[PDB]
Design a protein around this ligand. Structure first.
Ligand SMILES: Nc1nc2c(ncn2[C@@H]2O[C@H](COP(=O)(O)OP(=O)(O)O)[C@@H](O)[C@H]2O)c(=O)[nH]1
Ligand SMILES: Nc1nc2c(ncn2[C@@H]2O[C@H](COP(=O)(O)OP(=O)(O)O)[C@@H](O)[C@H]2O)c(=O)[nH]1
Ligand SMILES: [Mg+2]
Ligand SMILES: [Mg+2]
Lengths: 175, 86, 86, 175
């Protein structure tokens, strides 16, 4: 009965993709991370409306040399796309159009949910990407916006609530 | 010497020497170690490339395998749900 | 020249003194390019060691796990052997 | 439910440990090999005198930098030790005393069988290690000697026969 949702996590290096996915699946912050090479798979079983769902996150690599051959695999039978930037790094935010173009060039269906996540919202004195800017980007691309913190998982939009919201949407096939 | 003379030709037999203890000899004596270091660098770089390429290949095979497992389980769910109509 | 005069000696001297600064410049232009190549090799060797260290760390965790799973299986099996000698 | 025999394979780089172990577990010569990093594990289930046994081969690394801090793991609860040299490479045969010294300094019981395998017996025009030398070495160390070929697996001592014999002795607790 346990059906699987493949969810890929896309974005520049060091925006915190590894920390986000690990926070959601393991429920803690990494002692240490290194450059993600190829991809990392993290899985968590939850229950929505009595159904057992396996949320399967693909923490992709952001460096070209570390994602070289992998994009076809990333995008094969993907159920949802999570785009991620660093709220303290405007360049990570300006990268998003090219990530979206890669996505649009490789999706195999027109009905795959995409969402936008700003990470490291705990670092308020160093934030470079204002909410309203991010919000307009998200709205005009048909993505909900979340501002979150893998480090402090209850700040602003809860890391838990993000992936659970997405999982609910997928399970019910709702907008 | 406030007023140099011919004996100051010592400088010549003192300058034809110092220079030679390096220049054309040392040029090749650094060319050798430089080409050697070039070779070491290309070896090390080549090695990083093989390591990275190998790691990437194993990740691609694992990703392929997982996609195939997901696909199998999905067909299982489809079949079961087909049983749920008849 | 069958009999060297001072003109021949002098033009020899000026020519050697030109070739000298030529080879000097060619030396100085490589004495530090070597330092840079040194730095590049250092960096690349560093990346090399990081890659290998991370690979070895994963292999060590995997070997440890396999030994633990073997031991688990062994004690499981010998637990079966005690619930038959009842 | 089945008994596992852990069997480790030790020896210089390039003597054919990967090819030997793969030949036994998969029944094929490998298309390509690369330097073994850390260790590779290959398993094969066999039936000996009516019992299902999992033969678990540890194809170890022979390069110093690829076996750093592994040796404790190689030797933990090991059931048998297979030493390997290259019959076409005398240096690999001269390495054996250091490998054995490592084994002796790391074994935790005095009743673990050890065997000696010269590989690449198919390369007869290039053999550097005469049979009588190796035989004397093996006899004086209480190891049986096998001369074999992972590439041509029915030559001289059959690969299958080597590992099956070892497994037979383990199961029987026989000399
Ligand atoms: N302050 C803060 N730092 C974070 C957060 N998430 C990740 N980081 C840090 O950002 C760096 C990159 O994280 P990582 O997960 O490796 O980024 P990735 O390359 O996108 O996977 C690491 O030093 C993390 O500790 C967060 O929510 N808050
Ligand atoms: N001719 C021949 N070549 C072999 C044999 N076994 C291994 N090799 C070759 O020896 C090389 C190294 O083999 P490998 O298994 O990777 O050595 P390892 O480092 O000890 O694991 C490869 O080129 C193999 O094809 C054999 O029985 N005969
Ligand atoms: Mg990372
Ligand atoms: Mg090998």
């Amino acid at each position: 009965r346990s059906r699987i949702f493949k969810i890929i996590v896309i974005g520049d290096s060091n925006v915190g993709k590894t920390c986000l996915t690990y926070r959601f699946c393991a429920g803690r912050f990494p002692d240490r991370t290194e450059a993600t090479i190829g991809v990392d798979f993290r899985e968590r079983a939850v229950e929505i409306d009595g159904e057992r769902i396996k949320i399967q996150l693909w923490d992709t690599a952001g460096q070209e040399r570390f994602r070289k051959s992998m994009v076809q695999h990333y995008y094969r039978n993907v159920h949802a796309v999570v785009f991620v930037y660093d709220m303290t790094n405007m360049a990570s935010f300006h990268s998003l159009p090219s990530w979206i173009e890669e996505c649009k060039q490789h999706l195999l269906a027109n009905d795959i949910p995409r969402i936008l996540v700003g990470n490291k919202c705990d670092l308020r004195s160093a934030i470079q990407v204002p909410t309203d800017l991010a919000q307009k980007f998200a709205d005009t691309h048909s993505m909900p916006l979340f501002e979150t913190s893998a480090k402090n998982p209850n700040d602003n939009d809860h890391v838990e609530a993000i992936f659970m919201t997405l999982a609910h949407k997928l399970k019910s096939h709702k907008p | 010497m406030l007023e140099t003379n011919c004996l100051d030709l010592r400088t010549k037999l003192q300058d034809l020497e110092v220079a030679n203890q390096t220049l054309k000899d040392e040029y090749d004596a650094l060319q050798i170690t430089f080409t050697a270091l070039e070779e070491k660098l290309r070896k090390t770089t080549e090695e990083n490339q093989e390591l990275v390429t190998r790691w990437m290949a194993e990740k691609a095979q694992e990703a392929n395998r997982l996609n195939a497992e997901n696909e199998k389980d999905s067909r299982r769910r489809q079949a079961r749900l087909q049983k749920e109509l008849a």
